[PDB]
Amino acid sequence: TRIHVVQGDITKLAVDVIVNAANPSLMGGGGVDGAIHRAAGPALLDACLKVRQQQGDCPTGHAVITLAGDLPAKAVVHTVGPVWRGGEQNEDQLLQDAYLNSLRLVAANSYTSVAFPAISTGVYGYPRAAAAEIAVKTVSEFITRHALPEQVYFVCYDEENAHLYERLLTQ
């Protein structure tokens, strides 16, 4: 009842917090990162540069929160998923960290809902089934233990990722 699968563009979803699958520079990129920067407008990049002055780059697994610009969200949490290098560089733990640290920022800032993209499964090349398992398990445990966020949306950009998530949530 608190976890939903949505098919579409994360930049259109009205939620308190949209999560960005960023890179450590925080200055944007070509996937959902680029889509979020484009939808938010230049204010987002300017906010990310301030964050760089405060705390430098965002290392793999870390998360930072900023304003959301023209997005229909109150804030954007930027996190950096691992690059898949075949499983022996601790990618599973780092992906879990990205989800957990993002959820912690949502809760610490008293936000009630959050939307996640499929972190690391695009250009970072994380096997989709394993990544979704990690997202679902991590989120599930967290909301079992915490009242915030109240609602979590797994935003899937294609039918097949939506199906993996829907199948995982019913197990």
Ligand X SMILES: Nc1ncnc2c1ncn2[C@@H]1O[C@H](COP(=O)(O)OP(=O)(O)OC[C@H]2O[C@@H](O)[C@H](O)[C@@H]2O)[C@@H](O)[C@H]1O
Least distance in Å: CB of 85 to ligand X?
13
Structural tokens at position 119: 């972190």
Please give the Cα distance from 145 to 135 (Å, whole number): 16
Least distance in Å: CB of 147 to ligand X?
26
Count of residues that interact with ligand X, criterion CB under 6 A: 25
Out of 15, 21, 114, 132, the only residue in the binding site for ligand X (CB under 6 A) is 21
Asked about 33 being catalytic, the answer comes back as yes
Least distance in Å: CB of 145 to ligand X?
26
Contact positions toward ligand X, by CB under 6 A? 9-11, 21-23, 29-35, 81, 117-124, 155, 157, 161
Q: Which residues are catalytic?
A: 33
